[PDB]
């Protein structure tokens, strides 16, 4: 699809069989989701945002479907104001910015 | 232009005569620039993201050129780690996400 930016670009994603709303975020290197349980082991990761750095859990090779497009990659889990889809998965679904 | 998300979408903008580097950020409601002086009056505001909130000065009706396209709107100034062009100005240059 083509998504304009008059409103937040929030889309539906599916992870672990659950539907969730998430923000397509070109300013994010990575994908950060609100607290949830994911399979496997996790490793520590520090991320920096507008308000400073926080510690999150890193889960690799996680299946997630975004607006109908499948992606498998790294998902970070931690205290985030909203579920964020970052460039690591935006590139997997072929997303680009255009003007 | 069509901008890839393999790398951070950093572009050159011009504001107050000054040329600067800024991140096209569909995850940001507003545009936030690193500390600088702007003309006109401003009012304080708090904005949040990963890491929490930061206090910024809000200036209205500021003109910026983004990759040659003029855009007018509110510009917040504060301790952001990088200049961010948010949706309030991305809409003005006809910026969309496509996949």
């Amino acid at each position: 699809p083509q998504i304009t930016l008059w409103q937040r670009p929030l889309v539906t994603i599916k992870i672990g069989g659950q539907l969730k709303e998430a923000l397509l975020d070109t300013g994010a290197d990575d994908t950060v989701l609100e607290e949830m349980s994911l399979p496997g082991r996790w490793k520590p990761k520090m991320i920096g945002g507008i308000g400073g750095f926080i510690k999150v859990r890193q889960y690799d090779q996680i299946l997630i479907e975004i607006c109908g497009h499948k992606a498998i990659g790294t998902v970070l889990v931690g205290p985030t104001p909203v579920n964020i889809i970052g460039r690591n998965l935006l590139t997997q679904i072929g997303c680009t910015l255009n003007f | 232009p069509q901008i890839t998300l393999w790398q951070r979408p950093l572009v050159t903008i011009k504001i107050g005569g000054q040329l600067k580097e800024a991140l096209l950020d569909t995850g940001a409601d507003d545009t936030v620039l690193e500390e600088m002086s702007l003309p006109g009056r401003w009012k304080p505001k708090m904005i949040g993201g990963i890491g929490g909130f930061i206090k910024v000065r809000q200036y209205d009706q500021i003109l910026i050129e983004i990759c040659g396209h003029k855009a007018i709107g509110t510009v917040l100034v504060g301790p952001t780690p990088v200049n961010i062009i948010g949706r309030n100005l991305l809409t003005q240059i006809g910026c969309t996400l496509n996949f």
Binding site: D25, G27, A28, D29, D30, V32, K45, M46, I47, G48, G49, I50, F53, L76, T80, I84, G86 | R8, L23, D25, G27, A28, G49, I50, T80, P81, V82, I84
Partner: peptide, 5 residues
């Protein structure tokens, strides 16, 4: 660092 903006 991993930047999430």
């Amino acid at each position: 660092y991993d930047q999430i903006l």
